[PDB]
């Protein structure tokens, strides 16, 4: 559905990658705290 | 090469960031398993 649909496609991909990113941050903080 | 080329540019950046994201997930899982 054109360039406009592809822009919504990419925004949704970025938003979901951000959820993944915050999960990886959470995990790193959990582990750092246990080690240090 | 216009808006269409820039959309392919951004999709490729997102896709490669996803490969990085899955590598960081792998590392966190490796470490969590060893600690816990």
């Amino acid at each position: 559905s054109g360039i406009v649909q592809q822009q919504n496609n990419l925004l949704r991909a970025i938003e979901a990658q951000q959820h993944l990113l915050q999960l990886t941050v959470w995990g790193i903080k959990q582990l750092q705290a246990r080690i240090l | 090469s216009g808006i269409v080329q820039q959309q392919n540019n951004l999709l490729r950046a997102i896709e490669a960031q996803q490969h990085l994201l899955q590598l960081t997930v792998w590392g966190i899982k490796q470490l969590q398993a060893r600690i816990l």
Binding site: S1, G2, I3, Q5, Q6, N9, L10, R12, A13, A16, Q17, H19, L20, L23, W26, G27, Q30 | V4, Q7, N8, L11, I14, E15, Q18, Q22, V25, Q32, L36
Partner: peptide, 29 residues
Amino acid sequence: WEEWDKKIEEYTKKIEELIKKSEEQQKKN
């Protein structure tokens, strides 16, 4: 860590689906 595993899997499949969808939209353009 159980909820972490479930959300990682949830968002990974969501992102994979969005990337495929965008690839199909890109080849059309």
